[PDB]
Design a protein around this ligand. Sequence first.
Ligand code: MG
Ligand code: MG
Ligand code: MG
Ligand code: MG
Ligand code: MG
Ligand code: MG
Ligand code: MG
Ligand code: MG
Ligand code: MG
Ligand code: MG
Ligand code: MG
Ligand code: MG
Ligand code: MG
Ligand code: MG
Ligand code: MG
Ligand code: MG
Ligand code: MG
Ligand code: MG
Ligand code: MG
Ligand code: MG
Ligand code: MG
Ligand code: MG
Ligand code: MG
Ligand code: MG
Ligand code: MG
Ligand code: MG
Ligand code: MG
Ligand code: MG
Ligand code: MG
Ligand code: MG
Ligand code: MG
Ligand code: MG
Ligand code: MG
Ligand code: MG
Ligand code: MG
Ligand code: MG
Ligand code: MG
Ligand code: MG
Ligand code: MG
Ligand code: MG
Ligand code: MG
Ligand code: MG
Ligand code: MG
Ligand code: MG
Ligand code: MG
Ligand code: MG
Lengths: 68, 223, 102, 94, 43
Amino acid sequence: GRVRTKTVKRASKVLIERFYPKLTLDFETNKRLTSEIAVIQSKRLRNKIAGYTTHLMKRIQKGPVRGI
Amino acid sequence: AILSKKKKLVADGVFYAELNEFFTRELAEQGYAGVEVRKTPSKLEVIVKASNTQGVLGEQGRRIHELTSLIVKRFKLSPEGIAIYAERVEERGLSAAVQAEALKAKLLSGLPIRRAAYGVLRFAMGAGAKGVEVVISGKLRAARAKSQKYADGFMIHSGQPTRDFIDIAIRHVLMRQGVLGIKVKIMKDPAANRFGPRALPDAVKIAEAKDEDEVIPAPTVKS
Amino acid sequence: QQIHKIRITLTSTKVKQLENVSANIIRNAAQYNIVKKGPVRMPTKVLKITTRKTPNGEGSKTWDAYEMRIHKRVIDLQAPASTVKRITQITIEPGVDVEVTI
Amino acid sequence: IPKEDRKKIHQYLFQEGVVVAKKDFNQPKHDEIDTRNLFVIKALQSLTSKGYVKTQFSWQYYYYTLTDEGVEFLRTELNIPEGPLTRLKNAPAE
Amino acid sequence: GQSDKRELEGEVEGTEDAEAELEAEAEENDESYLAELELSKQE
RNA sequence: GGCACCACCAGGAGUGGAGCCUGCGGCUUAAUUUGACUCAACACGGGGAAACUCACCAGGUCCAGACACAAUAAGGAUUGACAGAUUGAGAGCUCUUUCUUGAUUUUGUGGGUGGUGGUGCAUGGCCGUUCUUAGUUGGUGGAGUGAUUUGUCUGCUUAAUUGCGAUAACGAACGAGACCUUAACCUACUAAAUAGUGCUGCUAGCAUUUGCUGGUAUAGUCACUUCUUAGAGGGACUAUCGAUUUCAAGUCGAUGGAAGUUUGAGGCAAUAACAGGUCUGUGAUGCCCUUAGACGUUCUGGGCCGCACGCGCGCUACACUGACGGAGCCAGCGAGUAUAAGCCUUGGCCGAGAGGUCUGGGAAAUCUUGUGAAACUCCGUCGUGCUGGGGAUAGAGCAUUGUAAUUGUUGCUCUUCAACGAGGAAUUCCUAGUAAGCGCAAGUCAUCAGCUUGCGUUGAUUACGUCCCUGCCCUUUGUACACACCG
Ligand SMILES: [Mg+2]
Ligand SMILES: [Mg+2]
Ligand SMILES: [Mg+2]
Ligand SMILES: [Mg+2]
Ligand SMILES: [Mg+2]
Ligand SMILES: [Mg+2]
Ligand SMILES: [Mg+2]
Ligand SMILES: [Mg+2]
Ligand SMILES: [Mg+2]
Ligand SMILES: [Mg+2]
Ligand SMILES: [Mg+2]
Ligand SMILES: [Mg+2]
Ligand SMILES: [Mg+2]
Ligand SMILES: [Mg+2]
Ligand SMILES: [Mg+2]
Ligand SMILES: [Mg+2]
Ligand SMILES: [Mg+2]
Ligand SMILES: [Mg+2]
Ligand SMILES: [Mg+2]
Ligand SMILES: [Mg+2]
Ligand SMILES: [Mg+2]
Ligand SMILES: [Mg+2]
Ligand SMILES: [Mg+2]
Ligand SMILES: [Mg+2]
Ligand SMILES: [Mg+2]
Ligand SMILES: [Mg+2]
Ligand SMILES: [Mg+2]
Ligand SMILES: [Mg+2]
Ligand SMILES: [Mg+2]
Ligand SMILES: [Mg+2]
Ligand SMILES: [Mg+2]
Ligand SMILES: [Mg+2]
Ligand SMILES: [Mg+2]
Ligand SMILES: [Mg+2]
Ligand SMILES: [Mg+2]
Ligand SMILES: [Mg+2]
Ligand SMILES: [Mg+2]
Ligand SMILES: [Mg+2]
Ligand SMILES: [Mg+2]
Ligand SMILES: [Mg+2]
Ligand SMILES: [Mg+2]
Ligand SMILES: [Mg+2]
Ligand SMILES: [Mg+2]
Ligand SMILES: [Mg+2]
Ligand SMILES: [Mg+2]
Ligand SMILES: [Mg+2]
């Protein structure tokens, strides 16, 4: 399965509550932004966080999300 | 003589492994931590880290002089080709080897286990360790043997970081009724690491909001 | 016995110091106008030893698989012999051993 | 042990007051005392038996070191002048 | 330490051992004729 | 309720049936040393034992019994010994025999020391198992006098206590996940005479059109990094789009992509626990036993292989989707030495072979080596026949290793050519480069691989589901158990 974990789910939603204006609906742009916003120890976690942040951003434009 | 590359790097490792145990048996009472073999032209620098650098360098450095001679005569080295230095460990509390050797010298003095165990729990944490857990196994007056764990603080268990931020030391303690086995696991604080990673893999540090400025309609500031 | 085509062979277990010594020599071979060839990454050799986990012979048949990676690099220099040897002392590292062959 | 072979064992454990011997009893020559290797082990087993040398064993090797009390013993028994090397006060380094 | 006592006096006695040693150890750091000739002089 | 090819469904390959290899029990034995007995004992102790190993058996040596004493002792305490006897022995082991050495040492006391001797039910460490299942824990708040409890859950979802969500809980930690190693992509960087290529010198063969195959090339003092190597990076995050869903966590389809099963595979891996296994790994150990006619150690010979039998891991096969005979002819993982005590060995020359011999290369991306491996493919012989399937058992002979091959180490040649004609009740492993074949290398190793650990060649059938069997986990429940049903 592809269930994201809590270390990526809670860390991604802190970004939205803190840097929503600079975020976007594009993963490639989000991936570069999170490399200068957060100190991520591994490259794999950086893309995972931005990939779920993009999903939340894509979901926010359709209505209000829980936890943000 | 002519030794292959595969067989030469292994020989250096085997030489280190045998040399390291030699210090553990000889300098056990001085809190021996580890040895560093710094090869250099025309010399073989060996750096030993011990809690007490007086027992090694005692009575006008007689023991260290008489100890380097035991290595020239066993490895067929030139008398000038090796130099041994004794260096004090900076943070004695962060070295599990020193803490395990120190505990053995207390257990062999008849001190109670609870008083001895808490003496290393607080000494490790006092030095700034992120976590520490001590397990002592064996037999004490009772015919049946038992083990007791003494944890404190934060400890990681799985994955690569245990190889990066945790050092461990096990020694056997010779008692009148049998052998006591002690394990001293010390996790150092990753923020103070100077060679490897400086944080745990899943530690995410989000920056602060730089926003909440006031925007003015449309001027131009010339220079 | 002057300018020669000189080989320096670098072997070590760890790559960080190997590339630092390799890059430091290349750096010193750059500001000094000495033509150079390298570094050449030799195929790394994986020394593998597979033992049984059990000190005794009881339990599930479980095996350890230990490894010892050996990385070897050779660099070719065109300089007099006095110049190359003093470069070695500039870039001396405990982990990496150096052998020089003409 | 012949008295003469015993002697060479004593002027090696003095002047370089440490002795290393590999654990093989049938070795013809300990490569540093021109006598049987077994003689070296048993001759120094008596000295450590009488508190003149510390003995340490690691990886099938004997590490013999001469006590300060043992220098006095060879001072008189060897009938040597009252003037080894690991005690020459070469002093350490900082 | 199989009692409510001797572990009480194991912690308070154990911790004062370290507190005495951290300060002592942190103070320990802040204030930091030959022979072969006699065998050849038989001339 | 839930999960799981060490469970099942659909299937594949089988095992159990034959011969043989090997392990276990048994029997036997002079000894056939010993541990382990469901999973988690039985090709396991890296245990493929000629000697050694070795612990067993029949015999023969040595002290390598330190040290304080006491005795003896230079008018010699003691050690070595030719020759003959004795002995398996050119062991002065011992006996006749007188020579030699000289306070090292002989006897008694204590004290040692050494034990593959006993105790893994006295211990350390290590390892296996519960279990790699998903479980474990505290702070504040709520409930209870308390031990405790909630948090840690109806439901959906996930490989997962992992997430959504419900919520007297809120916010967290270990474990999981993250992490690390490896495999797959990069005509985008960095270079490579120990890698490769095109050109270019020089050069060969075939048709002559200037073409096609080569050799040569460590001075052509060339060009380049695609193939090869490896360091710094980039790249996949379920990306975009459709469906379902509490529109949530997610799941299933397409499209793009090297990769969309956690991208494939592993390494590490929580809180406790077991009388699990090892004192036969340790100069790791407590205690007991032994310690000179040794249970130490060594030498010789045998045994661990011994054979009416039961069991387990396997290898060959029962043929034609095949055997032979020629021919074609492709990998990857790896290893390799010196005055040794002998490594990998091409090339040449002998030999039917096995093997022998002379040189040379390689401490290695250089040489062995493109390890020209085997299955495989083509063309032939065979023609359903215990046949040219199968190759036990055995006779005679030829080589290698080793001090030593007898109880055949192994290899080679000729001959003999057995059961076996697809295997009962039962039972194992497995979902994609997987299973199955098929070999090759590394470990053990003087010699011996039907064994493991890996590697690559050819390469599928059938699910992608369930709790029916089996095992485990969770919830509820009962309990006279708590040394916890071995109660
Ligand atoms: Mg973790
Ligand atoms: Mg993990
Ligand atoms: Mg089954
Ligand atoms: Mg079935
Ligand atoms: Mg069947
Ligand atoms: Mg079969
Ligand atoms: Mg034997
Ligand atoms: Mg024998
Ligand atoms: Mg036997
Ligand atoms: Mg024995
Ligand atoms: Mg046990
Ligand atoms: Mg145990
Ligand atoms: Mg609470
Ligand atoms: Mg409370
Ligand atoms: Mg209350
Ligand atoms: Mg609870
Ligand atoms: Mg959890
Ligand atoms: Mg964790
Ligand atoms: Mg060339
Ligand atoms: Mg050409
Ligand atoms: Mg993985
Ligand atoms: Mg038992
Ligand atoms: Mg024992
Ligand atoms: Mg034993
Ligand atoms: Mg053991
Ligand atoms: Mg014992
Ligand atoms: Mg033992
Ligand atoms: Mg054994
Ligand atoms: Mg005997
Ligand atoms: Mg056997
Ligand atoms: Mg037999
Ligand atoms: Mg037999
Ligand atoms: Mg098996
Ligand atoms: Mg088995
Ligand atoms: Mg054929
Ligand atoms: Mg054929
Ligand atoms: Mg090759
Ligand atoms: Mg026939
Ligand atoms: Mg046939
Ligand atoms: Mg035959
Ligand atoms: Mg079954
Ligand atoms: Mg054999
Ligand atoms: Mg082999
Ligand atoms: Mg085997
Ligand atoms: Mg069921
Ligand atoms: Mg109850």
